[PDB]
Design a protein that fits this description.
This is part of a larger assembly, with 8 copies of chain A and 1 copy of chain B (31 residues). Chain A is mostly helical and 50 residues long. Chain A has 2 helices and 1 strand. Chain A is elongated and about 45 Å long. Chain B is largely without helices or strands and 31 residues long. In chain B, 0% of the residues are buried. Classes of the chains: A mainly alpha (50), B little secondary structure (31). Chains in contact: A-C, A-E, B-C, C-D, C-E, C-F, C-G, D-E, E-G, E-I, G-H, G-I, H-I. At the A-C interface, β1 of A face α2, β6, α5, α6 and β11 of C. β1 of chain A pairs parallel with β6 of chain C, so a sheet runs across the interface. Chain G: It comes from Pseudomonas aeruginosa. Chain G: Belongs to the resistance-nodulation-cell division (RND) (TC 2.A.6) family. Chain G: It is found in: Cell inner membrane.
């Protein structure tokens, strides 16, 4: 379950777009949603909830 | 922002701040 | 010798070909509906103003040569055939300069217009292509000073035209921050949050199905009304371990950031690419040297590199070690082999500038430049100046 | 290959529904077909117009047709040997052919 | 040699006629061009991502795959590109004169030194490796005459009926069809999901 | 044009100078 | 597996990706009821087969993760067989102990 | 001629051609495909009509 | 709605058949010039050609 928690909390998740196609008629706002990214430092790996 | 301000639609790429410019009512908004 | 350096250099002075490229770039963060009303306004202009030359225009959106996204579109303009449009004003060089001047009326897009070179497998745009090979050794996104020199500080055009980006400016993005402590303390596990946010917005692909005897795909995504705004992030629910639904904004917030929608890696460092053409009247070599007074303003670490169809201008250049220095070197040997003397093969290669003296004059009077067809033309005129010499010196040497 | 594409469409177009069509919005082969035939018409304007200067300098219609049978027999003699080294006929060979 | 073919005119004729005919039967066989092979060889490799961001696929699927193909002989310059709609391009060219098939297999057996770093949802689509040069040749396809055909069913008909005959003819090394086929789109309603206590999983 | 203008001056000049350069006096 | 299951899960997914092959003449295919397939593709006359089989395999490895997991663990085979056998060996020395 | 005594098997005896790499039987071969999107049963009906 | 195609050993016959009429005229002219290279006439080679 330590391996499972690492595999669940250190991921790169495709979170899509905020105005992604096919949009509604009249959409004027379009951006990219940045969800979960991979951890970089050891302190980020230390605060992984078991 | 306040009432009576003139915010800038169409023509954003060709214009930097601090530039003398002339204005026309824009046709890109819905109203 | 002075008039040889007075002429400029080029490579393949290109042709009409009936084709024209035109790309648009709406400001960053624009939807495709904003791009379509620029693309259609460009399309309607070419079919009523320039109907004498333009045959048909094919406009795609969501994709150009600069990149991809909702803020990008391009047009393949196929013109009339060569006999249906007479007059030099119906060339693509006179259509491009008068459509590019009209495209400054379009305020909400950097619309351009350009032609491909004479070769089509090499290059997709006439003119120079220079890459900002920025070897400063810095971190991967602290190199924004290369971009700062790339915007206008490498665009100080004295005699250039249509100097344009080939990447795209960075845009706002929406960083969705989820704290795992509060989310886990309401029972809902984090892998289900990941699967919910990856299926509802990210359009998962589950398996395959078959219709009309062909295997196709089945996708899965939320409805378009539920993924348009940041508040629509708060419309989705996740089931915890007890079996009830937690809203998404009970454990997740959002925050705007700024990031690039395109990242490269060119020869070991992420460069930025600049396209541009010479102004009507001058050649390509003086344009590639007129950007050299622009590149002298530069920060630390960066450099300019010619590549693509501009790689041959700075890897071939003038082949003064090989072309017309070892070509006519061996003709002195092969005429000493047949004249059986030392000085009479020297005399017939002494008259070699008397042919190129008007070969330079004709391209100076017509206004052309030093290219590969000019080089292979001079390599004929060496033999032409030699064959007039040998035909009248053979009888001069046999009669003696 | 473009002939192959057009016959590939031209064999399976009746299976296509009548409520459809096909155009060619962008294409480069009329450029090839025009830029070959133009240099053919320059070789045609260089095979008979080189005959007039020898007819003018020799003043004899029986003494000026000797090189004009000699000029088209070396020329297609080139079309073997450039075919021998795998090279293709294009305008780049044909420029030197008009020069030769 | 002189003094021989001048008193023998038929023997002078026959060699000129056979050197005429050996070239004259050659123009029926060799292909007709307008330009030779002028571009340097170049191959490319693409993959798409459903709903990614540009920085998910920049430090991962570009930089480690970039350096391995440095060392390949007869080479000009290397590039890469990563987009925000979830697409990559790891194109690599060569110097002019090399055989493009051995130039493809050198990059092929050199770029299995970074193959397992890939997620499963884009290893399902696979890395499409082509020998695309840079440019197109022609484009095919248009709307119906009588209307009642959107910009989706035309693309579906193109990639479902006329594409796989077009991808097997000669010359074709790449294709960039503007659109895609059908897919059974399921559009989830979030309000109707928690009305039954369900998740998209 | 580069070969037309190159040939015309290779004709109207060299017929004067090639006989002038065969009679160069160093060929004793 | 059945012939329909094999044809619509293995054959179509592989032959849907077989594009961009040099000197490909045609692609025949068959799928049997005992769960087997052949996708024997014939090239042009006068082609060395070493580049041909690796050009087939480079496009096959593009399609091999789309296959179900029950057939990836069986292992695809790409051969350059001609059509037909050359020799057959093997028999029992009949003592009744060994079976078929 | 002897193999027609076997009632429950369409036994077919033959010989390979002189060359081995071309064909497995003597004669020709033809494929009858579909290119519209019609079913399997209409193609089998066309095969039986042929 | 359905189509047909040729395969097998009977495919190359459809692109170009047995080209014995396409030869035996090229091979006739190339020996017609070759014995004229020996006999140095036009009627004397032609009479022995047949």
């Amino acid at each position: 379950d330590v391996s499972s928690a690492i595999q669940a909390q250190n991921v790169q998740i495709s979170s899509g777009q905020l105005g992604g196609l096919p949009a509604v008629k009249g959409q004027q706002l379009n951006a990219t949603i940045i969800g979960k990214t991979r951890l970089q430092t050891a302190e980020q790996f230390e605060n992984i909830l078991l | 922002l306040n009432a009576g301000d003139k915010i800038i639609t169409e023509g954003l790429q060709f214009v930097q701040p601090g530039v003398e410019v002339k204005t026309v009512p824009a046709k890109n908004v819905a109203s | 010798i002075w008039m040889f350096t007075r002429i400029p250099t080029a490579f393949l002075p290109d042709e009409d070909q009936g084709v024209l490229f035109a790309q648009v770039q709406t400001p960053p963060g624009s939807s495709a509906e904003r791009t379509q009303v620029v693309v259609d306004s460009m399309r309607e202009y070419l079919l009523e103003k320039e109907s004498s030359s333009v045959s048909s225009v094919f406009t795609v959106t969501g994709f150009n040569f600069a990149g991809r996204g909702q803020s990008s579109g391009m047009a393949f303009i196929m013109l009339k055939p060569w006999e249906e449009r007479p007059g030099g004003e119906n060339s693509v060089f006179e259509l491009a300069k008068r459509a590019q001047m009209h495209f400054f009326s379009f305020k909400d897009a950097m619309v351009f217009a350009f032609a491909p070179p004479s070769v089509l497998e090499l290059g997709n745009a006439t003119g120079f292509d220079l890459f900002l090979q920025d070897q400063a050794g810095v971190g991967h996104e602290v190199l924004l000073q290369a971009r700062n020199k790339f915007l206008m500080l490498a665009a100080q055009n004295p005699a250039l035209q249509r100097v344009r980006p080939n990447g795209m400016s960075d845009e706002p993005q929406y960083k969705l921050e989820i704290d795992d402590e509060k989310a886990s303390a309401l029972g809902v596990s984090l892998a289900d949050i990941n699967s919910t946010v990856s299926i509802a917005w990210g359009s998962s692909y589950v398996n395959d199905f078959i219709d009309r005897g062909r295997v196709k795909r089945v996708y899965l995504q939320g409805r378009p009304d539920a993924r348009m705004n940041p508040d629509d992030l708060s419309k989705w629910y996740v089931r915890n371990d007890k079996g009830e639904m937690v809203p998404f904004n009970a454990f997740a917030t959002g925050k705007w950031e700024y990031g690039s929608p395109k990242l490269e890696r060119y020869n070991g460092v992420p460069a930025m690419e600049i396209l541009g053409e010479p102004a009507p009247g001058l050649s390509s070599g003086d344009a590639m040297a007129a950007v050299e007074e622009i590149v002298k303003q530069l920060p630390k670490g960066v450099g300019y590199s010619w590549t693509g169809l501009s790689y041959e201008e700075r890897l071939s250049g003038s082949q003064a070690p090989a072309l017309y220095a070892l070509s006519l070197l061996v003709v002195f040997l092969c005429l000493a082999a047949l004249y059986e003397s030392w000085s009479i093969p020297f005399s017939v290669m002494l008259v070699v500038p008397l042919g190129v003296i008007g070969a330079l004059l004709a391209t100076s009077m017509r206004g052309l430049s030093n290219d590969v067809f000019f080089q292979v033309g001079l390599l004929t005129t060496i033999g032409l100046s030699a064959k007039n010499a040998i035909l009248i010196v053979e009888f001069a040497k046999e009669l003696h | 290959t473009a002939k192959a594409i057009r016959q590939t469409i031209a064999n399976l177009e009746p299976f296509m529904p009548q409520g459809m069509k096909v155009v060619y919005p962008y294409d480069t082969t009329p450029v090839v077909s025009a830029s070959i035939h133009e240099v053919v018409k320059t070789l045609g304007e260089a095979i008979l117009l080189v005959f007039l200067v020898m007819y003018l300098f020799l003043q004899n219609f029986r003494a000026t047709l000797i090189p004009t049978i000699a000029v088209p027999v070396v020329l297609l003699g080139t079309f073997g040997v450039l075919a021998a080294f795998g090279f293709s006929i294009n305008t780049l060979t044909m420029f030197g052919m008009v020069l030769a | 040699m002189s003094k021989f073919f001048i008193d023998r005119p038929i023997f002078a004729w026959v060699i000129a006629l056979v050197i005429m005919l050996a070239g004259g039967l050659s123009i029926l066989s060799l292909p007709v061009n307008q330009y030779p092979a002028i571009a340097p060889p170049a191959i490319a490799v693409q993959v798409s991502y459903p709903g990614a961001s540009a920085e998910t696929v920049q430090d991962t699927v570009v930089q480690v795959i970039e350096q391995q193909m440095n060392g390949i002989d007869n080479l000009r310059y290397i590039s890469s590109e990563s987009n925000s709609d979830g697409s990559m391009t790891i194109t690599v060219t060569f110097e002019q004169g090399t055989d493009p098939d051995i130039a493809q297999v050198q990059v092929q057996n050199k770029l299995q030194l970074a193959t397992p770093l890939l997620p499963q949802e884009v290893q399902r689509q696979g890395i499409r490796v082509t020998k695309a040069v840079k440019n197109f040749l022609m484009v095919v396809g248009v709307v119906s005459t009588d209307g009642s055909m959107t910009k989706e069913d035309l693309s579906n008909y193109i990639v479902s009926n006329i594409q796989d005959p077009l991808s097997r003819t000669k010359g074709v090394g790449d294709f960039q069809v503007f659109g895609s086929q059908y897919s059974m789109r399921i559009w989830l309603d979030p309000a109707k999901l928690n009305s039954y206590q369900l998740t998209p999983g | 044009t580069g070969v037309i203008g190159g040939m015309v001056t290779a004709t109207v000049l060299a017929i004067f100078w090639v006989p002038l350069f065969y009679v160069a006096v160093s060929t004793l």
